[PDB]
Amino acid sequence: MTTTMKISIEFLEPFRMTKWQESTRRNKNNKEFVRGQAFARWHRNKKDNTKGRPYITGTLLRSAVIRSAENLLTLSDGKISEKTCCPGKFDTEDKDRLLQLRQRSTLRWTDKNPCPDNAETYCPFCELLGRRFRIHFGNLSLPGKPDFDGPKAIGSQRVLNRVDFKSGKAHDFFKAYEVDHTRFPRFEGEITIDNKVSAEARKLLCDSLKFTDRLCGALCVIRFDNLAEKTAEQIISILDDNKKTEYTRLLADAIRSLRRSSKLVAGLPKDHDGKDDHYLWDIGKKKKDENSVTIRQILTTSADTKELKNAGKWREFCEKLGEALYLKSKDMDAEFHGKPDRLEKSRSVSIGSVLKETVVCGELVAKTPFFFGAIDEDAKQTDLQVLLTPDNKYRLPRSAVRGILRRDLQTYFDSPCNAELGGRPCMCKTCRIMRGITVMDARSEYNAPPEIRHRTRINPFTGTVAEGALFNMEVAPEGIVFPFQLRYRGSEDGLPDALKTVLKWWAEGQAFMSGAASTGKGRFRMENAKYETLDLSDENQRNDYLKNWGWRDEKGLEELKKRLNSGLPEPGNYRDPKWHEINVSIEMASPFINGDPIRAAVDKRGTDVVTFVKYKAEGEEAKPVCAYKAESFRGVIRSAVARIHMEDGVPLTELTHSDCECLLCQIFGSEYEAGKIRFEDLVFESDPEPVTFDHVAIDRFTGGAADKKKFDDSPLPGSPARPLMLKGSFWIRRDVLEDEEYCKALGKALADVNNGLYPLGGKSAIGYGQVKSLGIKGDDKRISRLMNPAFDETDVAVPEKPKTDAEVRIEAEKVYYPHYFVEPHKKVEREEKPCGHQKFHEGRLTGKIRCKLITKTPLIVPDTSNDDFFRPADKEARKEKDEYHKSYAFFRLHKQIMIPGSELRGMVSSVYETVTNSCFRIFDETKRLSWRMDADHQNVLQDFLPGRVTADGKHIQKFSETARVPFYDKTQKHFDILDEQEIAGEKPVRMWVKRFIKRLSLVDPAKHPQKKQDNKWKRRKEGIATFIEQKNGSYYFNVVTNNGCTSFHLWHKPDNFDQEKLEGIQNGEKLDCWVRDSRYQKAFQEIPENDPDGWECKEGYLHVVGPSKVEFSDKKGDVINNFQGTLPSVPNDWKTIRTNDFKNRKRKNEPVFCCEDDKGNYYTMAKYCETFFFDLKENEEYEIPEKARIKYKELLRVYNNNPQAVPESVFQSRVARENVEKLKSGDLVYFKHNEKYVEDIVPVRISRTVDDRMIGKRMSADLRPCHGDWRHPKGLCPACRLFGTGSYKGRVRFGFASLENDPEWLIPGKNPGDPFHGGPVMLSLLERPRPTWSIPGSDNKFKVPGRKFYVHHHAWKTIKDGNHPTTGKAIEQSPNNRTVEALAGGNSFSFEIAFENLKEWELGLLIHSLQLEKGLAHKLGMAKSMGFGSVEIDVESVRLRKDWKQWRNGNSEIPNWLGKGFAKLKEWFRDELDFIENLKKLLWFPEGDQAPRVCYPMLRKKDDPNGNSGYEELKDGEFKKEDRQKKLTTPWTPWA
RNA sequence: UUGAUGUCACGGAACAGGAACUUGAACAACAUCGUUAC
RNA sequence: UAGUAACGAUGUUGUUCAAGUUCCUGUU
């Protein structure tokens, strides 16, 4: 007796979902079951397990149908078809149930009796209301009834908000689930109607089902009828198998960046030679073990797997791989909800019968990168994320649009709302308009990943970043189009005036929707607006509206968009939007950098930092453009304001801004109110291609490149020819331009920015940034009227340089050395506190110094961007893999000769820090030294005893003595009778050892005429002689010693005098003879066939090392000559090398072995013997500490990395040939010990000795790098206060020097008429320095000398011709020297030095270090160990700064500064200023007719035509061991 | 998997504050091998 | 029982980033 009607709803927007709770907190007393009643619910079967499906109750649809029926019944004056309708009853006497009452002011029509219950025929509204069921409403569920695994598998919980209006920051908040509508767009159910309900109630029900449009926070229309985890584990295991475990976070941040495209893995950078050993992209490979994959190979084979071919799959793989790597690198409260008021009776009111409808279509594009915070969980790498769609599309929610309409409607009026989330609806002017507004979501169809930005926070006391202030941020691209649709229904004749004014504001590009609006985030603009007003008051238009469900669906919208008239309606009352745009145009004069290291790690150029580049969208694809961040510009202007204004004593950079109305707190805002000025990004107006500059860090002692300290950067190029314009804008509020107190502050700050201070960008300490001018427009001269400069234009001249007094006595026919260290003092002061990079102090100076550099000796500053600049034309370009002859040019920026700022910074820093006797800025406190020990028995080789380590690596057992066993000879055979188990020393052998051999001579007492002078004939006694056999040269004898106790057989070689005693031998005569003993320490295997004497059989260990001591050469040495032809070839394996020739041929002395390889090398090999350790003394061992093992490790590392070694791997020793690492267990060593503790372990007889301490502990404790903690503390060296350090910014900025006259090169070029290119000159070898010649020994006597200042001379006239400086031979090219292009003497440059917050004695010392006396000169450039690079600097106008208006050129104050600097220098050191005298002696320039000839020695004396006693004779006599330091300190000592 | 005579949740902007920055001459002379003889 | 004496040859590149901070303050 029923009739089922099947309905089905279909969503057009993401609906919302509530949270599940058990059936105990489901009363009217819970505050989360209420406020969760207007959403969809989540049912789970088998309670306590999150598994179920969503559903919508029937009571909610009943309430929506009731509300639509009330809204529809007053539109036809209460008559459905024929009969009038009763007003209905909404009163209930019981209120313990009915968990929620109605607070709505029910509509009215035809007020009459409420049709009491004791009736028999009701009003159709009472049949719809339900007065066994009359109209039963059923549950709506999913079509197929599936089962998901929880509420997080269909949706995502996001946080909503509730912001304030005056202090526009926040209030409480809440959160809810939202499910996307592209995955779950359909729900189904039915409605059970009785038979005898009516024939007019069904029409009302159908019209009410068609008139309802939203159910759960969304529009609707109701109708009726495993790789990434294992790859992460593999990469982590690779990083842990090696020692590169500190590159894990950079690897994570660089791998997450590859999610943009898969064509970036085949374009990762390489090394500088084009190899495949990058420092992070090639971790894992070794010298051996080819089956070792790297990270580049892992990313390459994972780029083509037929699973990661799509973009979404590759993006997801990159994201979760980066997340896993970040998580692996890691481990090394206020919310309101509800409270609705339970009102007893609703105040029923009438609204009338006039109802219209307005549709506004169009679209709104983005003009700046927008931001919508959707920071979710389970993703902790970015910590500031954006809102995305489940298919990675950008969207703007309707909550943000609704809140922004609310804010603009409150701003159009001048009265905020005062609602408190409860009770009767609010009835102000801005809540009667907001109750008829309906908007929609967007999708933007872009589908591209967002870029990541890095931000920091700077401590304004030191200048560096604060502790713990570093975070990321991701922003959406610029230029995305969102579809827009607004709909309003009310009683007016169209739109109101407030909405028309707000839409006219939005049509001018002033719709600041959401984001970090203070730093120039999303600003949209509504375009292509259409509108059309319907009329639901009549009946011929309402039925056509109800026939097609309005026009909400896609077909209805495509039919509606053909009826809308174009152009928005003009408002009746305009309001002049409250934001004003001001343009900004900056022009620079130097390079510019805005760091980005991750892009440098992914980029294929192979640099360390690259400039910042943002993307922009063109509809489906993104293109990059270089720009300047908005946060950096905002920070610059904020710091420029904060350092001038006082506000009651303490400046604005020291306040806490807790509850203060400071001047920064009222313009730039704080954590309690929003700001009133919004900046924006700055584009560069052109296409500047980045260039590459190389840098290095020159050590102080042994001035050369320090270890691990070579780097580069890729900034944008700018020069006084092409000035790198910058364009942008920023927005200010309307009620700030009208104030006269804030505009003055902004004008003062921009006037300080314009006058040269506050450089923009990165490394401004070497001449980057340097704003030349700044000009704003668009403000009617309210701010740009205080930005006018004002100088003095005086005529005071600059005082001339004083005359020098330190002179040297240089004579002819003598040579000099070029090093001459400068020994320092012993008192470096660190008892002063640094100033602080805050407000400009009162008694300190700030300004500019303009200098003038003029060269007087050829200068070389190379342009290391390319080699082969002097390459011949019209030939082959270059072979792939070879070592050619490098040749460079001079430095150019835009085809203009320049000198960088870091060169001058380093030079002046060295001179300034050696004047004030300050801390060694950069130093190498590692790398302990080592020396080869000499070959003399008494001094060194006496203490090294033979030994052997025990079964465990803890003790060394010593031996008694040694004897040498002959190998590689022709008089025995020891290789084919001993196996490999006994020649490696792991098994004892048994040899026969002889100690003393016996010579023979016939006449002892009557031998004084000929012999008996050698004094060795003092142990002869007597002896009888026999004869048993005849030989060719020798004769047999059987001699007794004193009484016939023993007899020995020997072979005696007679001589002239012996010949006569020989003459007759009948085998039986008794000759007279004498026996003498001589030393013979040999040990053979069996027995030799020449001495059948008593050999003492002993027991010991044997060990071999291989054929060492090769005198290889290239010029047919004295032993290869006078040979017997046909030299053999090199054998491919040892144990077969024999003796070829003898060194002495009269006697049978030392044997050699001459061979010849495929090249022109000629080897001559000594060492025809090996050593045998016998007589192992037990029960006496010595322990090995850790210092011995560290010394042994350094010894092995030196042995294995040697470029001067023998090219053949057969003639090396065992230590270097087999490449071993640690001390094994059971190997022979030569150790040194004293009282149970060993000191040194060497492998061979004559090896090298490593010193115990490092080189950092051979100085004083005060001269070490003045770095560390010992606001900032007071422990800083006097040179780390002018120039910076880590955790303290320096207050001196240098600048790019530029040439102004004509070049005037050294040698003319190849093309006449083009005076802008020079000719090439070829240099000498230029080999790296040796610190093992200044520190000769290692005990305690040799400390570290000074700072290695090179002397001035003229030795470039010999290189100009083509000879060598030491000899006179012509130099020949090779793949080890360069061919540079140089300038000549008589060129002029000009640069500028900016300083701030200096004292009056630091400026005097800086001027004394810039300009020297009138007889000295500086030295910069390349190859200044010859005569190359000699400059002098003259100082021009020194214009100071005293206020933000006037600058007061102070040329007339220099001598007071110089006197104060000298007075401070006298105060520190009383009368011990000898280091300044030495430094003035070392900077002396030969004024005239003096030609000091300096050069380095040669190796020996026989290889230079002058014969000047090279290094191998200078180690004895002059520079022996104790005069080295002394003779290298005196500024001009004769080279001898 | 809801209750019926009463749901303005299209009744609520994840908003407000923060300088990828600090320090650094692209430079530079004496070492490397071990034993041989009595 | 036991150790004493210092000699012979002339050739060759190296570093290519390092030390720091890598997240906080708050809504009623």
| Residue located via tokens 């002689």 | A1025
Interatomic CA distance for residues A1047 and A1075, integer angstroms: 12
Question: How far, in Å, CA of A1483 to CA of A1193, rounded?
Answer: 43
List Cβ neighbours of A1286 (8 Å cut-off, separation of 6 or more). Answer: A464, A1267
**Nearby residues of A63 by Cβ (< 8 Å), 6 or more positions away:** none
One domain, residues A1431 and A1516: yes
How many CA atoms, within 13 angstroms, populate the side-chain half-sphere of residue A160?
15
Q: What domain range includes position A457?
A: 356-577
Query: Which nucleotide lies closest to A269 by the C1' atom and the CA atom?
Result: C16
Q: Where do we find the tokens 């099947």?
A: A6
If one counts every other C-beta atom within 10 angstroms of the C-beta of residue A1346, the result is 21
A368 and A473 both lie in a single domain: yes
Burial A902-935 (b: 16+ CB within 10 A, else e): bbbbbbbbbbbbbbbbbbbbebbeeebbbeebee
Relative to beta strand A1493-1494, strand A1047-1052 is unpaired
C-alpha A1371: how far from chain center? 42
A172 touches A162 (CB < 8 A) = yes
Is the domain of A751 the same as that of A843?
Answer: no
Coil, helix or strand for A141? strand
Q: Is residue A1404 part of a domain?
A: yes
Tokens linked to A1349:
């200042």
Strands (E), A1450-1506: 1493-1494
Joined tokens for residue A1415: 């007889």
What is the C-alpha separation between A710 and A905, in angstroms, rounded? Answer: 17
Write the DSSP string, A1427-1460. Answer: S---EEEEE----B--SSS-----GGGHHHHHHH
Q: For residue A64, what is the enclosing H or E element? A: helix A58-73
Judgement on whether residues A192 and A261 belong to the same structural domain of the protein: no
> Amino acid identity of A853?
L
Angstrom distance (rounded) from CA A1523 to CA A1529: 10
Whether residue A1088 lies inside any domain: the answer is yes
Write down the number of H helices and E strands in chain A. 26, 54
Q: Taking the C1' atom of B3, which residue's CA lies nearest?
A: A59
Alpha-carbon torsion, ordered A1059, A1064, A1065, A1069, to 10 deg: -100
| Tokens (6 digits) for A1091 | 């001495």
Are A5 and A224 contacting, i.e. CB atoms less than 8 angstroms apart?
A: yes
Q: Which nucleotide minimizes the distance between its C1' and the CA of A1205?
A: B32
Q: Is A33 left (phi over 0), alpha (psi -120 to 50) or beta?
A: alpha
Q: Give the dihedral sign, CA A501/A506/A511/A513.
A: positive
Residues A152 and A247 in one domain: no
Q: Which nucleotide is nearest to A465 (CA to C1')?
A: B21
Which ranges of A310-451 would DSSP assign to H, the alpha helix? 311-330, 398-412
Contacts of A215 (CB under 8 A, 6+ apart): A9, A15, A56, A60, A61, A64
CA distance linking residue A54 with residue A147, whole number of Å: 9
Consult the annotation and say whether A361 binds a ligand: no
- List, in sequence order, every residue forming a beta bridge with A140; answer none if it has no partner: A56
Rounded Cα distance, A149 and A53, in Å: 9
Nearest nt to the CA of A425 via C1' is B8
Burial class of residue A713, CB neighbours in 10 A (0-12, 13-18, 19+): buried
Interatomic separation, CA of residue A1152 and C1' of nucleotide C8, rounded (Å): 12
Count CA atoms within 13 Å of residue A96 on its CB side.
Answer: 0
A1073 labelled ligand-binding: no
Q: Residue type for A1481, please?
A: K
Helix/strand/coil for A901: helix
d(CA A752, CA A644): 10
Token pair recorded at residue A1310? 């190849």
Q: What is the DSSP letter of A267?
A: G
Displacement of CA A174 from its chain's centroid (Å): 40
- Which method resolved this structure? cryo-EM
Question: Which nucleotides of chain B have an atom under 7 angstroms from any protein CB?
Answer: 1-38
Give me the residues paired with residue A224 across strands.
A7
* A435-474 residues near strand B (Cβ < 7 Å): 435, 437-440, 454-458, 463-465, 469-471
Q: What is the DSSP letter of A1515?
A: T
Alpha-carbon gap, residue A645 to A928, rounded angstroms = 54
| Dist. CA A754–CA A594, nearest whole Å | 20
- Same domain for A566 and A655? no
What H or E segment, with its residue span, contains residue A754? Answer: helix A742-754
Q: For chain A, what's the residue count?
A: 1536
Query: Would A785 be classed as within a structural domain?
Result: no
Residue tagged 């020159």 (tokens): A698
Q: CB of A172 within 8 A of CB of A336?
A: yes
Strand duo A15-17 + A1162-1164: pairing: unpaired
> Is there a contact between A1231 and A1238 (Cβ–Cβ < 8 Å)?
yes
DSSP class of residue A1255 equals: G
CA of A995 to C1' of C19 (A): 62
Here the contacts of A1521-1530 (C-beta below 8 Å, separation 24 or greater) are: A1521/A1336, A1521/A1337, A1524/A1333, A1524/A1334, A1524/A1336, A1525/A1334, A1525/A1342, A1525/A1343, A1525/A1345, A1528/A817, A1528/A819, A1528/A820, A1528/A821, A1528/A1334, A1528/A1345, A1529/A820, A1529/A821, A1529/A822, A1529/A823, A1529/A1345, A1529/A1346, A1529/A1478, A1530/A820
Alpha-carbon torsion, ordered A625, A628, A629, A634, to 10 deg: -150
β-bridge partners, A1337? none
Residue A1272 per-residue DSSP state: -
In chain A, what is the straight-line distance between the N-terminal and C-terminal CA atoms, in Å?
A: 130
Number of domains in chain A: 6
- Identify nearest nucleotide to residue A435 by CA to C1′ distance: B10
Contact A486, A364 (CB under 8 A): no
Strands annotated E in A1060-1188 = 1071-1072, 1074-1084, 1096-1103, 1141-1142, 1151-1152, 1154-1156, 1162-1164, 1169-1183
Within 10 angstroms of residue A2's Cβ, the number of other Cβ atoms is: 9
The span from the CA of A309 to the CA of A303, in Å, is: 8
The reply, when asked if residue A417 is annotated as ligand binding, is: yes
Q: Which two tokens stand for residue A1535?
A: 């080279």
Place of tokens 């003498």: A1076
- Angstrom distance (rounded) from CA A595 to CA A597: 6
User: What's the resolution in A?
Assistant: 3.5
Six-digit token pair at A826? 């012993």
A1165 DSSP assignment: B
Does one domain contain both A573 and A667?
Answer: no
Residue A1485, domain member (yes or no): yes
User: How many Cβ atoms sit within 10 Å of the Cβ of residue A1268?
Assistant: 12
Q: Rounded CA gap, A594 and A629, in Å?
A: 8
Measured to protein CB atoms, the chain C nucleotides within 7 Å are 2-28
Which of A1071, A1103, A1135 terminates a domain? The answer is A1103
According to the annotation, is A206 in a ligand binding site? Answer: no
Cα–Cα nearest to A82, from A112, A124, A122: A124
> In a 10 Å sphere around its CB, with 0-12 CB exposed, 13-18 middle and 19+ buried, how is residue A1191 labelled?
buried
Closest-approach nucleotide to residue A597, Cα vs C1'? B20
Residue A1097 marked as a ligand binder: no
CA–CA distance, A300 with A296 (Å, rounded to integer): 6
User: For residues A60 and A735, what is the distance between their CA atoms, to the nearest angstrom?
Assistant: 48
Domain boundary among A1063, A1082, A1103: A1103
Tell me, yes or no, whether A1043 and A1062 share the same domain.
Answer: yes
Q: Which residues contact A1291 (CB under 8 A, 6 or more apart)?
A: A835, A837, A1282, A1284, A1395, A1396, A1397, A1398
Please check whether residue A42 is in contact with residue A20, taking contact to mean a CB–CB distance below 8 angstroms: yes
Residue A418, token pair as written in the block: 């005062």
Q: What are phi and psi of A265, to 5 degrees?
A: -75, -30
- Within A 1321-1340, residues with CB less than 7 Å from strand B: 1325-1330, 1332-1334
Query: In Å, what is the separation between the CA of A943 and the C1' of C2?
Result: 18
In this structure, what token pair is assigned to residue A1051? 């072979």
A1266 is in an annotated binding site: yes
Can you tell me the distance from the alpha carbon of A601 to that of A474, in angstroms, rounded to the nearest whole number? Answer: 19
Residues A188, A52 share a domain: yes
Which CA distances in Å does A1407 have to A1099, A1393, A1413? Answer: 78, 11, 11
Angle between helices A201-211 and A58-73 (to 10 degrees): 100
For residue A252, how many other CB atoms are within 10 A of its CB?
23
**Inter-residue contact A252 to A246 (CB < 8 Å):** no
A1364: DSSP letter: -
Which of A 925-944 have CB under 7 A of nucleic chain C? 934-938, 941-942
Query: Which nt sits closest to A1166, CA to C1'?
Result: B35
Residues 6+ apart with CB under 8 A from A273: none
CA distance A901 to A905: 6
Residue ending a domain, choose from A1103, A1137, A1168: A1103
Using alpha carbons, select from A266, A285, A380 the residue that is nearest to residue A323: A380
Question: CB of A765 under 7 A from strand B?
Answer: yes
Kindly determine whether the C-beta of residue A1111 is less than 7 Å away from any atom of nucleic acid strand C. Answer: yes
User: What letter represents residue A167's amino acid?
Assistant: S
Neighbour tally for A648: CB within 10 Å: 7
Residues A698/A906, Cβ–Cβ less than 8 Å: yes
Is there a single domain that holds both residue A60 and residue A7?
A: yes
CB atoms within 10 A of CB A1328: 7
Give the residue before each break in chain A, using a C-to-N cut-off of over 2.5 angstroms; say none if it is continuous: 131, 225, 332, 1270
A428 annotated as a binding-site residue: yes
Query: Is A414:A400 a contact under the CB 8 Å cutoff?
Result: no
- In the numeric block, the tokens 């992209």 are attached to A281
Q: What angle do CA A857, A1403, A1462 make, to 5 degrees?
A: 90
Q: Are residues A1504 and A1366 in the same domain?
A: yes
**Torsion on CA atoms A1365, A1368, A1372, A1378, rounded to nearest 10:** 10
Q: What share of chain A is helix, strand, coil (3-state, %, to 5)?
A: 20, 25, 60
Q: Kindly determine whether the C-beta of residue A143 is less than 7 Å away from any atom of nucleic acid strand B.
A: no
Q: Is residue A429 located within the same domain as residue A507?
A: yes
Alpha-carbon dihedral sign for residues A1035, A1041, A1042, A1043? negative
Distance in Å from C12's C1' to A1059's CA comes to 56
Is residue A10 in some structural domain? Answer: yes
DSSP assignment, residue A426? Answer: P
DSSP assignments along A540-606, one per residue:
TTHHHHHHTTTT-SHHHHHHHTTSPEESPPPPSS----SEEEEEEEEEESS-B----HHHHHHSSS-
CA–C1' A708–C18 (A): 6
Phi, psi of A1514 (to 5 degrees): -80, -15
Structure tokens at A1377: 């020297």
Map tokens 């040999």 to a residue: A1082
Residue A235 parent element (H or E)? helix A228-241
Q: A1519 in a domain, yes or no?
A: yes
Q: Is A272 within the bounds of a domain?
A: yes
What Å distances lie between residue A378 and A150, A156, A179, A320, CA to CA? 16, 12, 19, 11
**CA-to-CA dists, residue A269 to A281, A301, A714, A1264, angstroms:** 8, 17, 15, 38
Residues A1449 and A791: beta-carbon distance below 8 Å: yes
Distance A935 CA to C4 C1' (A): 14
**Amino acid, res. A628:** Y
A107 touches strand B (CB under 7 A): no
Distance between the alpha carbon (CA) of A1205 and the C1' atom of B28, Å: 22
Q: For residue A152, what are its two tokens?
A: 């997080």
Q: Give the residue carrying structure tokens 């070490």.
A: A1264
Sheet holding A15-17, edge to edge: A15-17, A174-179, A155-160
Token digits for A1530?
A: 């005196």
Task: Examine residue A1217 and state whether it is found in any structural domain, yes or no.
Answer: no
How far is residue A520's CA from residue A901's CA, in Å, rounded to a whole number?
Answer: 34
Helix axes A228-241, A248-255, angle to 10 degrees: 150
Asked whether residue A333 is marked as a ligand-binding residue, the answer is no
User: Regarding beta strands A682-683 and A622-628, do their DSSP bridges make them parallel or antiparallel, or are they unpaired?
Assistant: antiparallel
Please say whether the beta carbons of A531 and A359 come within 8 A: yes
* Closest nucleotide C1' to the C-alpha of A100: B7
